[PDB]
Amino acid sequence: SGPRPVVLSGPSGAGKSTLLKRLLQEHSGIFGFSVSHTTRNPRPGEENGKDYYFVTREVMQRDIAAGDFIEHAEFSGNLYGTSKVAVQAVQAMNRICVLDVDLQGVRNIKATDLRPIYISVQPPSLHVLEQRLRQRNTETEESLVKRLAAAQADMESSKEPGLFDVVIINDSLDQAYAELKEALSEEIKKAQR
Numbered sequence: 001s002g003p004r005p006v007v008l009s010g011p012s013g014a015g016k017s018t019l020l021k022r023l024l025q026e027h028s029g030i031f032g033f034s035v036s037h038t039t040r041n042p043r044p045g046e047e048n049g050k051d052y053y054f055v056t057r058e059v060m061q062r063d064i065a066a067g068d069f070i071e072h073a074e075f076s077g078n079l080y081g082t083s084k085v086a087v088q089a090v091q092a093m094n095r096i097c098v099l100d101v102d103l104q105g106v107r108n109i110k111a112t113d114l115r116p117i118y119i120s121v122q123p124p125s126l127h128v129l130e131q132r133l134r135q136r137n138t139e140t141e142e143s144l145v146k147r148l149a150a151a152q153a154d155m156e157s158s159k160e161p162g163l164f165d166v167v168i169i170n171d172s173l174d175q176a177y178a179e180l181k182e183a184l185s186e187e188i189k190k191a192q193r
């Protein structure tokens with residue numbers, strides 16, 4: 001009836017992070033980022049407590065047994081999870097929770113009662129995704145290949161009926177960001193009432 005959380009997914013290197021950062025900055029009073037937990041090493045320019053909760057695998061696994069995570073899955077040999085407190089933190093600020101998860105996270109979230117909107121940020125082609133991943137250069141050659149492999153599997157699943165409410169083709173960043181705003185108009189209107 002009113003505002004609902006937002007689940008944004010897609011293949012690695014498809015522009016999900018950049019689209020969210022512009023959305024969060026331009027709409028700080030509407031959207032709050034869900035800070036997931038990860039076991040991978042921090043990228044340059046990454047800050048703990050904002051992009052992720054950078055923890056070791058022992059710390060992450062101790063939290064899984066403690067039940068701190070609404071969802072969790074492994075990706076590229078590193079652990080990821082959405083903590084229950086991460087969603088509650090955004091809810092405590094009267095903001096729409098925006099989550100960045102993989103395909104496994106989306107299916108896990110389909111079980112939960114958050115009832116979010118599902119947005120898939122897709123590249124124009126698989127080859128373009130490789131170039132954008134290679135330009136970022138934050139992954140090893142082996143990690144890039146398996147990230148490419150998971151991209152195509154998530155690419156085909158993006159066409160699953162009823163999985164993604166809205167699919168964004170990330171060809172032009174301005175065009176993709178405009179489409180993101182348009183699909184979020186109902187959420188922004190609901191939050192502002």
Ligand SMILES: Nc1ncnc2c1ncn2[C@@H]1O[C@H](COP(=O)(O)OP(=O)(O)O)[C@@H](O)[C@H]1O
Pocket residue numbers: 010011012013014015016017018019132135136170171172173174176
């Ligand atoms: N519209 C676009 N055109 C060209 N490159 C883009 C576009 N959007 C994003 N990128 C590339 O994607 C990279 C960042 O991707 P990122 O959002 O971190 O991937 P993920 O979706 O896994 O978070 C940047 O290096 C940027 O060059």
Ligand SMILES: Nc1nc2c(ncn2[C@@H]2O[C@H](COP(=O)(O)O)[C@@H](O)[C@H]2O)c(=O)[nH]1
Pocket residue numbers: 009010011012036037040071072073075080081082083100101102103104105106
């Ligand atoms: N299941 C799940 N996946 C996540 C979570 N956070 C990030 N991911 C996904 O894991 C991958 C990690 O990408 P990175 O953040 O290392 O660039 C991305 O596909 C991202 O969407 C999470 O909390 N849970």
Ligand code: ALF
Pocket residue numbers: 011012013016017
């Ligand atoms: F969210 Al990414 F590579 F930046 F999976």
Ligand SMILES: [K+]
Pocket residue numbers: 034035036099100101
């Ligand atoms: K996240």
Ligand SMILES: [Mg+2]
Pocket residue numbers: 016017100
């Ligand atoms: Mg990201």
